[PDB]
Amino acid sequence: RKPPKGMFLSQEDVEAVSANATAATTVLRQLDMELVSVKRQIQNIKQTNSALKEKLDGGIEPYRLPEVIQKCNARWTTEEQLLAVQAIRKYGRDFQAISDVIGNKSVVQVKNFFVNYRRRFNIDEVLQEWEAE
Amino acid sequence: PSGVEGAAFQSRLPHDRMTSQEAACFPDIISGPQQTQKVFLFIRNRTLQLWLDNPKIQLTFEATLQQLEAPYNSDTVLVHRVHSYLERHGLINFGIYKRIKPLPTKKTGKVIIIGSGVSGLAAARQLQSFGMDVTLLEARDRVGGRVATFRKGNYVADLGAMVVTGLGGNPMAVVSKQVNMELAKIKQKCPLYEANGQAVPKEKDEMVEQEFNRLLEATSYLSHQLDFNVLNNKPVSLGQALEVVIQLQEKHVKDEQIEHWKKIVKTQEELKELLNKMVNLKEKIKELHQQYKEASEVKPPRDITAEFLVKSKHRDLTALCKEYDELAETQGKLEEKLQELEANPPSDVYLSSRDRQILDWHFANLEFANATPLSTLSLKHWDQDDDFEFTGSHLTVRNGYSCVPVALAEGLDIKLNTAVRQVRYTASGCEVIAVNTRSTSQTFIYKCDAVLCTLPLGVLKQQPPAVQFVPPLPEWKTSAVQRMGFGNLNKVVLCFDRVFWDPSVNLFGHVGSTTASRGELFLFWNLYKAPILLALVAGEAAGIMENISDDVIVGRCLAILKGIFGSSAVPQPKETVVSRWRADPWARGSYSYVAAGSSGNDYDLMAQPITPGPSIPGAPQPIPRLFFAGEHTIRNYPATVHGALLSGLREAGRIADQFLGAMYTL
Numbered sequence: 001r002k003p004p005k006g007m008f009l010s011q012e013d014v015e016a017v018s019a020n021a022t023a024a025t026t027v028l029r030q031l032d033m034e035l036v037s038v039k040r041q042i043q044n045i046k047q048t049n050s051a052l053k054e055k056l057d058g059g060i061e062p063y064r065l066p067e068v069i070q071k072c073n074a075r076w077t078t079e080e081q082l083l084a085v086q087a088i089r090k091y092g093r094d095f096q097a098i099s100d101v102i103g104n105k106s107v108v109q110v111k112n113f114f115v116n117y118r119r120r121f122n123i124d125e126v127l128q129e130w131e132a133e
Numbered sequence: 134p135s136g137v138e139g140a141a142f143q144s145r146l147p148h149d150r151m152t153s154q155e156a157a158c159f160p161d162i163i164s165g166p167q168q169t170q171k172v173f174l175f176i177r178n179r180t181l182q183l184w185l186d187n188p189k190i191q192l193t194f195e196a197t198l199q200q201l202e203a204p205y206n207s208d209t210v211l212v213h214r215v216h217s218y219l220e221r222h223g224l225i226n227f228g229i230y231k232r233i234k235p236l237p238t239k240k241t242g243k244v245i246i247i248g249s250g251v252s253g254l255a256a257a258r259q260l261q262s263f264g265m266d267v268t269l270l271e272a273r274d275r276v277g278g279r280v281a282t283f284r285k286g287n288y289v290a291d292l293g294a295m296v297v298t299g300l301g302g303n304p305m306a307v308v309s310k311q312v313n314m315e316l317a318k319i320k321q322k323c324p325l326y327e328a329n330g331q332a333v334p335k336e337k338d339e340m341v342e343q344e345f346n347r348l349l350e351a352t353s354y355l356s357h358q359l360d361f362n363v364l365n366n367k368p369v370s371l372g373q374a375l376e377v378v379i380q381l382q383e384k385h386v387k388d389e390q391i392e393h394w395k396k397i398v399k400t401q402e403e404l405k406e407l408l409n410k411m412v413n414l415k416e417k418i419k420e421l422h423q424q425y426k427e428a429s430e431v432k433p434p435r436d437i438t439a440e441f442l443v444k445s446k447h448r449d450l451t452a453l454c455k456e457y458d459e460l461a462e463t464q465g466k467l468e469e470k471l472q473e474l475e476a477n478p479p480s481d482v483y484l485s486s487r488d489r490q491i492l493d494w495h496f497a498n499l500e501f502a503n504a505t506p507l508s509t510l511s512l513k514h515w516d517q518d519d520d521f522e523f524t525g526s527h528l529t530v531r532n533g534y535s536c537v538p539v540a541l542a543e544g545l546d547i548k549l550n551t552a553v554r555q556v557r558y559t560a561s562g563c564e565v566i567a568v569n570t571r572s573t574s575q576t577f578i579y580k581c582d583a584v585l586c587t588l589p590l591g592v593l594k595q596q597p598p599a600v601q602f603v604p605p606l607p608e609w610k611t612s613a614v615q616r617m618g619f620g621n622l623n624k625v626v627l628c629f630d631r632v633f634w635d636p637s638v639n640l641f642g643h644v645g646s647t648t649a650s651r652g653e654l655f656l657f658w659n660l661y662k663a664p665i666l667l668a669l670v671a672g673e674a675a676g677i678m679e680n681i682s683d684d685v686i687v688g689r690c691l692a693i694l695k696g697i698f699g700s701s702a703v704p705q706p707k708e709t710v711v712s713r714w715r716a717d718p719w720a721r722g723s724y725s726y727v728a729a730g731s732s733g734n735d736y737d738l739m740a741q742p743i744t745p746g747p748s749i750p751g752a753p754q755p756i757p758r759l760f761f762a763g764e765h766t767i768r769n770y771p772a773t774v775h776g777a778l779l780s781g782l783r784e785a786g787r788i789a790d791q792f793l794g795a796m797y798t799l
């Protein structure tokens with residue numbers, strides 16, 4: 001019902017090798033050239049990637065900044081309020097980004113800022129100009 | 134198998150069922166109730182048991198009925214009908230046995246038997262046992278035919294047969310109890326030595342043997358599961374199938390490689406996109422860090438816009454550094470996935486030159502068995518006789534297989550050095566024309582009621598014919614002769630003065646250099662008491678080595694043996710014999726094979742006798758006059774001695790039923 005395990009004998013392959021006299025050698029050559037063609041495309045990308053791997057030499061180590069470990073605070077200084085308006089004008093509704101810019105305001109405190117100071121800081125007009133970009 | 138059921142197995146009969154041959158002679162029993170069939174089946178098995186328990190004396194009907202028990206021994210005409218059937222068809226009282234009832238004083242009918250091989254000798258013994266005048270005509274100066282034994286000094290080696298392929302169900306087991314045969318088992322161990330002269334490691338010997346046996350099953354799958362049996366209106370041969378299977382395996386080796394390196398370009402190209410993304414991110418990071426620096430240079434105090442600029446750049450720079458880190462994480466995954474694929478490559482090749490050579494040795498081993506190159510064997514039917522293989526180890530005739538036909542020829546009218554030239558059969562009898570092989574002008578005429586032709590298939594194939602038939606054989610017979618294959622394999626006997634090989638090893642092999650020469654001296658056999666090595670020439674080399682002198686053949690043998698055992702350990706042979714069966718005008722080959730486009734049904738066609746046309750137009754249907762026996766005439770046991778032995782008993786039963794009558798059919 002099935003061939004010996006390891007052998008591959010399909011009705012499709014038997015016909016493609018018995019089609020003519022040298023149909024066997026012909027099939028075995030198109031696979032040889034396909035192997036050579038794939039093999040040299042490897043060393044081509046293997047060489048393209050080897051050059052890119054040297055541009056990334058050093059990583060981004062001369063560009064990292066130390067970690068600001070500051071405790072989360074509750075009250076809003078007038079400075080932190082003005083930081084929030086500029087961050088809204090630049091980042092919109094990215095609460096995580098605005099939280100990181102202010103520094104000591106959690107993500108939920110930033111969301112509450114959108115509602116409490118909604119009228120006084122014209123957060124509606126500021127958001128509609130971030131959307132104009 | 135043991136008991137009365139073992140006697141049936143030993144006689145190649147089912148113990149619990151009536152055969153087709155038995156149904157023809159006992160149609161009242163097989164069509165009757167089940168209880169009667171079991172009685173008949175017991176009487177047959179019990180009679181076979183008595184004969185096989187002591188095959189050196191004739192088993193008479195009186196002795197059979199005496200050792201039967203009730204209720205089986207009550208019906209006497211049944212016991213008589215069974216005993217006469219078994220005796221007539223060579224199932225009991227065949228071979229060489231002491232006779233209790235002396236032969237009839239006067240003979241009935243005249244039969245001329247062409248050829249005194251085992252098939253002809255067995256038939257002559259039976260026909261004479263039944264009380265007929267039998268005369269054999271042998272072209273050679275000896276009996277045995279293709280059972281040929283070279284004897285010189287203490288050296289005895291068979292160019293003929295010399296192997297019994299198991300005793301379980303073999304009629305030769307009965308003959309071996311009648312004739313002093315020295316049967317010795319063959320040890321299956323066989324080391325391989327490459328052309329350089331060193332042995333093949335057990336790693337390769339087994340890995341190539343398994344692949345060989347795997348390739349064979351693949352052809353059987355091609356034949357019985359894909360119907361791959363015709364190609365361009367021509368029948369497919371076993372050689373063609375093996376070539377197709379191997380190429381498909383070499384094709385699959387390349388398909389596996391292409392799909393493996395394709396997994397590398399796909400992975401390596403994801404790395405290319407990733408590195409291009411990282412090199413652009415490191416660019417934005419380098420520019421952003423510069424802007425954050427310039428924004429920090431603005432020394433305090435500053436308005437909230439300048440403070441927002443530093444805080445903004447610090448966030449955007451930290452956000453890009455988190456992206457670059459997550460990309461370097463992905464780079465580690467893909468970079469190690471490449472060393473994963475580049476460390477586990479698929480097989481480089483299916484088989485190498487060193488492997489393909491050892492595989493050729495196993496193919497030559499198959500060409501030795503069927504005595505023909507695999508390009509001629511029928512893909513579907515080449516092994517059709519495997520289903521009837523005997524049980525037990527194979528044994529050699531250590532004292533020379535010629536002791537069997539010589540002992541059979543005792544007391545027979547054998548005309549040696551008599552070459553049959555013409556066989557004339559008409560509705561009123563036959564006449565065989567033969568000449569003396571020494572002085573061919575001396576002509577002999579033999580009149581007879583029937584002719585039994587056991588000529589080898591190679592002789593029946595000659596063109597122009599060595600034997601003319603008058604009238605010509607019908608087309609259905611001649612066409613069968615042409616379709617059937619008659620192979621060729623030769624033996625080289627080397628008689629030394631001392632043993633220099635491994636005594637506990639009965640055979641060792643020599644790996645040929647090329648596919649063309651793969652059967653040229655590929656196997657050596659130590660099977661005799663005296664220091665006698667025997668080398669085989671099979672396949673396509675069998676026919677070509679017959680055009681080469683014995684000195685050059687023995688020279689290639691000593692060269693092979695010197696590379697294996699030592700340049701100074703191989704002495705010169707004292708006696709050498711090289712067989713050439715294809716050139717033998719009385720054999721024209723070794724034995725038969727099932728050629729492509731043929732089948733086992735041609736074996737049955739070879740056995741059907743020939744009936745001439747009526748003498749007087751309008752006369753009743755004439756009697757069959759020309760009968761055929763021999764190695765090539767028995768479907769289930771061709772190309773063997775026991776097959777020839779059985780075919781002779783078969784025709785002797787049919788010829789006797791034709792000219793003496795069958796009194797057991799009532």
Ligand SMILES: Cc1cc2nc3c(=O)[nH]c(=O)nc-3n(C[C@H](O)[C@H](O)[C@H](O)COP(=O)(O)OP(=O)(O)OC[C@H]3O[C@@H](n4cnc5c(N)ncnc54)[C@H](O)[C@@H]3O)c2cc1C
Nearest residue numbers: 248250251252272278279294296553723763764773774777
């Ligand atoms: C090398 C080799 C090894 C073998 N090994 C084995 C083995 O191990 N086991 C096994 O079972 N079988 C073996 N066989 C096969 C075995 O030898 C044959 O199957 C068997 O011997 C043939 O019997 P036969 O009577 O049918 O043919 P033959 O023995 O050939 O009888 C035919 C006879 O007719 C004679 N004859 C030919 N032409 C004429 C003519 N024109 N006029 C008159 N007479 C003529 C011949 O001389 C011969 O005596 C081997 C065969 C060969 C070639």
Ligand SMILES: Cn1c(-c2nc(C3CCC3)cn2CCOc2ccc(OC3CCNCC3)cc2)cc2sccc21
Nearest residue numbers: 319321322323342498499501502503515516519527640
């Ligand atoms: C098998 N064996 C051998 C033997 N071992 C080897 C090597 C291979 C690993 C060790 C070679 N030989 C040579 C035989 O070559 C044969 C025997 C049987 C064959 O199968 C036929 C079956 C019927 N249909 C046709 C095919 C084919 C070739 C010595 C002896 S002695 C009794 C048995 C036997």
Ligand SMILES: Cn1c(-c2nc(C3CCC3)cn2CCOc2ccc(OC3CCNCC3)cc2)cc2sccc21
Nearest residue numbers: 296297298501502503518527658660667771772773774
């Ligand atoms: C050649 N030979 C042998 C034989 N000679 C040797 C050596 C000793 C010196 C030569 C070993 N052996 C046994 C293993 O070799 C076999 C066994 C079975 C075979 O199966 C054939 C059977 C007939 N139909 C076609 C296939 C073939 C080879 C025994 C038989 S029986 C018919 C011929 C033959």
